[PDB]
Amino acid sequence: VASGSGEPREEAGALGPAWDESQLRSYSFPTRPIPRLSQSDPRAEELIENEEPVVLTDTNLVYPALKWDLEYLQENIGNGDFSVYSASTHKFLYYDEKKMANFQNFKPRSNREEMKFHEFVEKLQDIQQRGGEERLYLQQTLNDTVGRKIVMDFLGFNWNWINKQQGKRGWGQLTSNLLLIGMEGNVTPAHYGEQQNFFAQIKGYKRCILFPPDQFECLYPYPVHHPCDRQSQVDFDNPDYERFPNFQNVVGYETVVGPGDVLYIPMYWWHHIESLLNGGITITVNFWYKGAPTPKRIEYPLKAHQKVAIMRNIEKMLGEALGNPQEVGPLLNTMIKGRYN
Amino acid sequence: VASGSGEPREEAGALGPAWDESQLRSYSFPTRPIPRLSQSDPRAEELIENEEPVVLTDTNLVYPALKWDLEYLQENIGNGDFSVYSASTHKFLYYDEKKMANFQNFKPRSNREEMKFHEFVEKLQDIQQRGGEERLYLQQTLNDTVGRKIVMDFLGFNWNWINKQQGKRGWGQLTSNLLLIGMEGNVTPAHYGEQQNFFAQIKGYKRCILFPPDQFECLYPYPVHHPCDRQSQVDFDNPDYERFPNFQNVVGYETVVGPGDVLYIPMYWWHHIESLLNGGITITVNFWYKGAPTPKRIEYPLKAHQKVAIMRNIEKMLGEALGNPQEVGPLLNTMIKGRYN
C-alpha cells in the first residue's frame, strides 16, 4: 500500500523504463502514491477541488516548452540576469535574504549569483568537465526580457485549460512562473507555500514528496521570522529524533513526474523535490496563483491550513508587538510553561 | 534584609504589640518589607507614581468607617443581599462563574450564597458557638441599598486625597468599592488585577504579600479562559515544584496592615492576603480604579505588565479564533514544540 512512486512507467516505443528505483534517495518514512490521471478524469477535477495533489498526464500545459533544452534556451532566453544558486551539498535549502538581518547567526549553505544564461551553461559545462562536485541550481522568474521565441512558446501554453482551473477554483491571479533548471541529484528540502501551484515538468524526472497541512506537528518549520520560514528544520538525510520526535510519525504522498506531467501542489501542502540521481539535468516551470479569498465567516471545525494561518499570524503579531523577533520564543514559552503544557 | 513584615508595631498607650509573628502562616519563599510612610512623604508619592506598593499610614481615607463593626453594620448597612462565600478550607480561591461552563471539570472549594447582613452575622455566630470549622468570607460591592448612616460614613471618606491621586496618576474612574469581612485565618490566594487598588484596612489585621508583575514566570496563573483566570495555580501551602519549578525563585514584598492603614496595590501586581490567625474578624474596604489609558505609541523596552497584557490578549484571541478555549493549549504547544523551546 505504501508503494511510493510505484512501478516505473514504460516509455512509448519500448524505449525501456523512464527511470529505476536506484535513482531515488532513501528516507526514513513511508509514502503512498499520488494519483496519476487524465485532465478529463472526473476524479482529477475532484482532487483539485478538494485541494489534494494529483498528477495530470495530458494537459499539454507547457507543450511548446517540451522541446526546450540548454542549447535552445541559451539561444532564445535573452540577455537578462538569472539567479543561480551554488552549494557544496545536494540540498538547496531556500532562505529569505530580507530576514537575514534578524538572524546574524544563520550561515547559508548555498549562495546566490546573478549571471547571463550563457554564463550558467558555461559554468555548468566547466563543472562536468573538470569532474568537480559543486552543484548549481538556476531559479529565475520568467520576465519581459526573454527572447521572442521563448515568448512564442509561452503563448503556446494551454491557457484555455489553466485559466478555467483558476476560474473554477476561484483562485486569485497568476503571480509568477518560476523557471527551474537543476543538476541531477539536486534537492529542494521540504517546505510549504501560501500559493496554489501547478508544477509543469519539461526535461528530466523529478521525485516529488508531499505531506498534508495536518502534518505541521511532524515537520517543525523554522520560526516565521527566521530566513528559512516555511521550510522544515528536519534534515531528511539525518533526522534528529530528539529534537523532532514527531518526524517518526510522518507519512508522505509521492510521485515521479516527467516531460508532460503537471503536478498540482495544493497551497499549504509541504513538498520535497529532488532531481533523480544520474538522471541528467532537469527543467521545470511552475505556475503560482494566489489562493481564493478567505471566507467571510469561518465554519467549524477549522481546517488544518487555517490553524497554520493562525499560528503564522500569532508569530508575526508578536514579533511586531515585542519590537524584536528574537523575543517571540521567550514570550511564547513563558505563556505555556506550567500553564498549557 | 528579607525581614518580611518587620518588627511588630507597638500600639499607642502601651497597649502591647498589635500582633506577633506566630499569627503569620509559614511559606517557602523570602520577602522584603513594603515601605510604611506618611501621605505627605515625597517618597510615598514617588512610589505610587512608579506604580510600586506603599503602605500609607495617615491618609484618613476611611476615617469614618474605623468605628464600623458587626453590630454597627448590621444596624445600618441595609436589607440588600450580600455575597457570602463558604468553604471548608482557609483558602478562598476566587473563580469566575461565567467561565465555569467552558471547564466542567472544575469543582470550586468555596460556594457563594446571598443573604441579609443579619443572616451573615447569625451564621457567623452560629459557627463560633458550636465550635464548627467551616469558614465564611463576605465580599460585597457597596451599592445604593446601604443605610443612611453608612452613606454618611461613605461621604466622610477622604475624597479630597484619593481624588487628587486619581487625577495625578491619570487613572480612569472609580469602578467600585468592595466590602470585605472575614474570619481570622481566612486567606485569599495570590492573584493580580487589571485595576489600580487602594486597600483600606478598618478592623483587624491582614498580612499582604505582593509580587511584581515580572514574577509572572514563577506564579503560573491559570489559563485566561479558566474560571480561575488571574489567580496563581501554585498551592502556597504545598508548592508542586515539579509542575511549577520557577516558584523556587519567587521573592515577595510583605506587610501587615491594621486600622487606618491604606495599602496601594499597583495594577498587575500579584497579591496574597491573609487575615492573621486568632486575630479575630477583619474588615476592609478597597477602591478599584481603572488604569490610565494605554499609550498612543509604545516605547521600548516594554514593561513587564505590558508583556502580560500581550499574553492575555493572545490567549483571548486564540480562544475566539479556534471557537473553543480548550483548543488554545494544543495550538500553543504545536506552535512551540521543536520550534521555540
Binding site: 522568474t141 517546505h191 501560501e194 500559493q195 501551484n197 503560482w288 489562493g291 478567505t294 499570524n313 | -
Partner: peptide, 13 residues
C-alpha cells in the same frame, strides 16, 4: 482576520 494569509513562496516577491 486571524485566518488571513499572505502569498509567500520559495521565490523573491
Amino acid at each position: 482576520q486571524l485566518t488571513s494569509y499572505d502569498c509567500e513562496v520559495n521565490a523573491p516577491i
